[PDB]
RNA sequence: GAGGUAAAGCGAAUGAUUAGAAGUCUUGGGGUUGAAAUGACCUUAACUUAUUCUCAAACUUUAAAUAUGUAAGAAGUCCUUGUUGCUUAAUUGAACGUGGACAAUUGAAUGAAGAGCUUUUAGUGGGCCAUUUUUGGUAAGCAGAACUGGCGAUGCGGGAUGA
RNA sequence: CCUAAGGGGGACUCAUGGAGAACAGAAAUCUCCAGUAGAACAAAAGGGUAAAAGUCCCCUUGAUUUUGAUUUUCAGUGUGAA
RNA sequence: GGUUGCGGCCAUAUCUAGCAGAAAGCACCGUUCCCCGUUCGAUCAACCGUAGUUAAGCUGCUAAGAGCAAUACCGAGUAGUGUAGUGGGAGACCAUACGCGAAACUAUUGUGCUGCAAUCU
């Protein structure tokens, strides 16, 4: 039979009708993939930090 | 008829090694393995025990590496030993032990870990590592850097190793390179190691040589002869020296007979200085004219 | 100064080679001869590759050689120069200042003959050098030797003629 | 037969620089990377562990993870009509701090220094950058520089 | 056997030279590029005449051989075999391909011949001779022009023979001792490098 | 006893270049 | 920041490649001077040295244009000191924080019928053409890629006529 | 295809050229010097590698266990591989 | 300023050939009982600093040096290229317009800088 093999023609037209959008930025990135040893300890540091601020305001 | 090899293209495409590798002084493979620190400890440095031997001196330094260059923490030289009571044999295995003990004590003095981490106060030659104190700061950790010097059981670098370990520094190591290690029966004969710590091999050489060749004893052991120092009181030379090293391990610089400026002015008088462009142009013109006499 | 004490020529090493073309008993007896002459256990060299014309194969133990230094080297060298009746050629000296010769029977050196051992020829090479060659052989700070301190053919020839009262031909 | 392996087409990208092969200078191993640092990515062909894919060679990103010998870098890659967040683990031999931070962080300091000085002097200062503007008027002196007249030159052959 | 040259006139493909990738390549028809008195010194033949291409084009090795033969024959017949030094300045390094020797499936061709890829202003043939032999050498090249496709110009060089110096700079460098013979070519003095070797090579160097 | 060790790397040599007859 | 294409280069590596010149104790040969000495001479051919003509998609020191990654702040910068079982010899750091200072030129331009987000579903999944880059082929109104713009899906004015 | 051709450590430095040594010659073995890699790294090719990643020696099983995260192809599914 | 130890950048530091080097340092250098490694105390190990030497290493200087580095009324606004026209030319290709813009070449200049510690006429 034999047909068209490949072409990227018209593909940039389609990507730019509604896309080519930069990703949104957030204040807190996800910690997925961050070192488990750091992540394990970072849990304890944040928990203790919340307690200290809670007591200071309770005063 | 062979091709001349050293062409201009050979020099053009030649890639020169690192300056201190071409000097044959730094093993950068070993240096990379020693220096590189866990990236999650960020700015905490690794400390090296640099041990270098010259023909006359033993240099022991505690070094941390930085981008602008290495930075010395403390340093003990073998030529500091006469202050502590060792005047001859400044390259013994025992002089190496003394230099290691001195650098360990001096570093601990600089840090403040003197009363804590005293070390092995009663040297019996047993293998031992500086153990941490519970509910206290960990011992100063240092890694041994022997440079290009070969690792052999009995080498002098491990004398500094044992001294630094006995001085209170935590230096990770094994005893199978100490003098007195039986490779067949994998245990350390601590008696022979203790013998080596207090100059026992040198004293035994003095005793064995004296009754077999008095003339050679007179030439090899001159300094001992004019000081009337025999073999039996060698150990005391070290045993006292140890105590003195622990009493005041602080660095006392040599009083300088001249100031820095006077030294610089004296040295600046010698060593030729480069010719001006005009001078060498005149030299070229003279050489051209003086070449005219071989025109045939 | 060209007349410096440390510029003194003297022998670095003497290397004794017997390249018996085969492996087995004959090579073993050549090794026995070398261990007898030098007093040190010699080392056997293996063929780097296979040649059918020479009857050798790769990694077949072909030759045996030994290196001697010090007074024993001097004694063996003069013992071999006696066999050569103290007469080498100019062509026997390399451009790097080393020289060599080859004896044809090892009983001419002055050792006992055994019918089991037989006679082997032998190859002598002497490596000359002044003091300070350790610079090129030490591990740390290895460097090269300056041109004046280098050993060359003329200095070695003159030193050999002076020290042995021998003749260096050039046929 | 098509070939599309991991390092296909990287013959020159992953080459060492001319007369720069061999051992890595140790400032590479002494640099300190913190989470949030901006780093350029350039694969070193002589270190094959922790090596980036050929896509990230020449890309710049944010460090998000720091491990024993490596950093995790966040890259935004175009996949069709949007960006996908990519998290690449790279040994520090293939990483260098981005020099774009140091220019902007200095302009922040310069703006802060200039503002307090004008505040100290009780005057005002304008800190917004400006593009190059058309040049002003000027007077050209002709003492020693009387105009020299040029003409187009005739055609010549020089072979 | 051989197709008409019109099938291979234009540089449509990338250069396809002999390599480890194409090995069954025939030889170029032209093998000799220097003719006449090629051992003559530079001073013997001051006049240089070029045949220059006014086309970005491909010239077959067959055409190169034919034009070389035509020019050589004419100039040696009219002025003698020792009155000139002819040099062919283009080497055919590009391999042409032929397909038939089904249809378009697997149509990658086999080596068929060799051609030189020339640009505009590129010299094809150079002839160094004496001035009095100008009109001969020109007529030798103009006939050779007929063996080539496209447009060529016969241009008299401003330079002395095959040297890169003009006919006035060569005389200046000659009376100053800055030129020495090297057989058919010359070597020029350098003010860089070992002074002694430079002085030895040019004894007649009037230094200033 | 002892034997010379292979300082070279020509593992699959088994012959040598330059070694041409008639030369 | 990245790149290795255009160009350029080959008295720069690799590979190809024209011509002489001067030299050397494996010169490769012919005639020799030689009674024979390998020890000269005439010669051609090898190499070496400094040169010479011409080249490379799967060569290259150098090296564009176009195109490409990141940044240009309030989620910023600086100061002090809280948390942890992580880290340091440590009172060192790491991360997250309390408190304080820097106010509209809050840190380039230009624009912005506003930005962001979600669900669901149609048709389509034969393409073709023009400029430029470009592969196979002698070429093709041939076959195949790159970017963009078009025709398809589109009338209108021009090209007589014509996707 | 590989119990090493995997892993760690150590020592050494390959292709090749020149000058020399009985048999020995173009090619056997020995010596020095030169030697930016012109070698070798199972195999196609490209990249990478010199106090090594090459050659030789010593010790070994990390060619092991639990599963997560990530990169490539990508629909950001699988598989393979990392 | 010299020197050593450890370095950063990694030839302005390399390569070749000459010449010079006070002090200290470094080095060569002397020895083999001991730990240790070798065919060989040559390398490696250990001992002495005692018998000697700056001959070499190292350092500095010299060279119309090779190489390397930097600069430019050098070449050259050339080659190439983004964009444009119902421009030229049968074509191959070329000119013009708004922009970007090399490499080779030529000339000149330079030939390590520097951090920590110790030491020295
Ligand atoms: Mg079909
Ligand atoms: Mg289809
Ligand atoms: Mg849009
Ligand atoms: Mg370098
Ligand atoms: Mg090591
Ligand atoms: Mg045989
Ligand atoms: Mg195929
Ligand atoms: Mg393919
Ligand atoms: Mg690159
Ligand atoms: Mg791997
Ligand atoms: Mg303001
Ligand atoms: Mg084509
Ligand atoms: Mg023909
Ligand atoms: Mg069919
Ligand atoms: Mg024509
Ligand atoms: Mg091999
Ligand atoms: Mg074989
Ligand atoms: Mg490419
Ligand atoms: Mg090109
Ligand atoms: Mg080109
Ligand atoms: Mg070029
Ligand atoms: Mg070339
Ligand atoms: Mg050249
Ligand atoms: Mg050059
Ligand atoms: Mg070539
Ligand atoms: Mg000659
Ligand atoms: Mg003849
Ligand atoms: Mg440049
Ligand atoms: Mg570049
Ligand atoms: Mg660019
Ligand atoms: Mg505080
Ligand atoms: Mg706050
Ligand atoms: Mg701006
Ligand atoms: Mg739908
Ligand atoms: Mg849909
Ligand atoms: Mg659908
Ligand atoms: Mg549907
Ligand atoms: Mg169709
Ligand atoms: Mg359909
Ligand atoms: Mg269009
Ligand atoms: Mg057009
Ligand atoms: Mg088509
Ligand atoms: Mg069709
Ligand atoms: Mg349709
Ligand atoms: Mg329309
Ligand atoms: Mg109409
Ligand atoms: Mg119409
Ligand atoms: Mg019409
Ligand atoms: Mg391996
Ligand atoms: Mg292994
Ligand atoms: Mg291994
Ligand atoms: Mg190793
Ligand atoms: Mg080479
Ligand atoms: Mg497995
Ligand atoms: Mg996958
Ligand atoms: Mg798949
Ligand atoms: Mg996917
Ligand atoms: Mg996936
Ligand atoms: Mg998967
Ligand atoms: Mg000064
Ligand atoms: Mg001195
Ligand atoms: Mg010795
Ligand atoms: Mg030693
Ligand atoms: Mg000296
Ligand atoms: Mg000297
Ligand atoms: Mg120069
Ligand atoms: Mg210069
Ligand atoms: Mg254009
Ligand atoms: Mg463009
Ligand atoms: Mg156009
Ligand atoms: Mg018109
Ligand atoms: Mg223009
Ligand atoms: Mg220099």
From TrEMBL, chain A:
Residues 1-34 are annotated as: Disordered. The keyword Metal-binding applies. Mg(2+) binds at residue 11. Belongs to the eukaryotic ribosomal protein eL29 family. It comes from the Eukaryota. InterPro entries: Ribosomal_eL29. One of its GO terms (molecular function) is metal ion binding. Keywords: Metal-binding, Ribonucleoprotein, Ribosomal protein. GO terms for cellular component: cytosolic large ribosomal subunit. It comes from Candida albicans. Residues 3-25 have a biased composition (Basic residues). GO terms for biological process: cytoplasmic translation. This is 60S ribosomal protein L29. Pfam families: Ribosomal_L29e (PF01779).
Automatic annotation (TrEMBL), chain B:
Its main location: cytoplasm. The keyword Zinc does not apply. It is found in: Cytoplasm. GO terms for cellular component: cytosolic large ribosomal subunit. Residues 234-293 form the Large ribosomal subunit protein uL18 C-terminal eukaryotes domain. It comes from the Eukaryota. Gene3D superfamilies: 3.30.420.100. Mg(2+) binds at residue 16. InterPro entries: Rbsml_uL18_euk_arch (IPR005485), Ribosomal_L18 (IPR057268), Ribosomal_uL18_C_euk (IPR025607). SUPFAM superfamilies: Translational machinery components. Keywords: Cytoplasm, Metal-binding, Ribonucleoprotein, Ribosomal protein. This is Uncharacterized protein CaJ7.0206. It comes from Candida albicans (Yeast). The gene is CaJ7.0206.
Automatic annotation (TrEMBL), chain C:
Residues 4-57 form the Large ribosomal subunit protein uL5 N-terminal domain. The keyword Chloroplast does not apply. GO terms for biological process: translation. One of its GO terms (molecular function) is structural constituent of ribosome. Keywords: Ribonucleoprotein, Ribosomal protein. Coiled coil: none annotated. Component of the ribosome, a large ribonucleoprotein complex responsible for the synthesis of proteins in the cell. The small ribosomal subunit (SSU) binds messenger RNAs (mRNAs) and translates the encoded message by selecting cognate aminoacyl-transfer RNA (tRNA) molecules. The large subunit (LSU) contains the ribosomal catalytic site termed the peptidyl transferase center (PTC), which catalyzes the formation of peptide bonds, thereby polymerizing the amino acids delivered by tRNAs into a polypeptide chain. This is 60S ribosomal protein L11-B. The lineage of its organism: Eukaryota, Fungi, Dikarya, Ascomycota, Saccharomycotina.
UniProtKB/TrEMBL annotation, chain D:
It comes from the Eukaryota. One of its GO terms (biological process) is translation. Gene3D superfamilies: 6.10.250.3260, Ribosomal protein L21 (2.30.30.70). GO terms for cellular component: large ribosomal subunit. Mg(2+) 2 binds at residue 125. The keyword Ligase does not apply. The keyword Metal-binding applies. One of its GO terms (molecular function) is metal ion binding. Mg(2+) 1 binds at residue 12. InterPro entries: Ribosomal_eL21, Ribosomal_eL21_CS, Ribosomal_eL21_sf, Translation_prot_SH3-like_sf. Pfam families: Ribosomal_L21e. Keywords: Metal-binding, Ribonucleoprotein, Ribosomal protein. Belongs to the eukaryotic ribosomal protein eL21 family. This is 60S ribosomal protein L21-A. It comes from Candida albicans (Yeast). The gene is RPL21A.
